[PDB]
Design a binder for these strands. Sequence first.
RNA 1: GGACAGCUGUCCCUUCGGGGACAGCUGUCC
Length: 76
Amino acid sequence: MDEGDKKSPISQVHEIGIKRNMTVHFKVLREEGPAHMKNFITACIVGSIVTEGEGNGKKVSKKRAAEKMLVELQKL
RNA sequence: GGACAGCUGUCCCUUCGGGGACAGCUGUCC
């Protein structure tokens, strides 16, 4: 039971990062690690700016973080 | 219900440099 957006932003972030000139790198500042679920504080860095994303759930963090980098990078 | 590791076999992608994937085996964990 969800909403439905389009697909994964990470792919398009890398596609645009390479097609344009931006180092698409995603990371976490707290929690996360090996046996875990990439979420909580997923931040994304790009060759121009950085984007923090406190995603707290399987539907946020990484997607929400990269999505913001996309919706913002799509403006500049 | 899943994220994250090595392996066995069969297999692919695209906005683009180049790449990877899916089941089984032992696992980290919640």
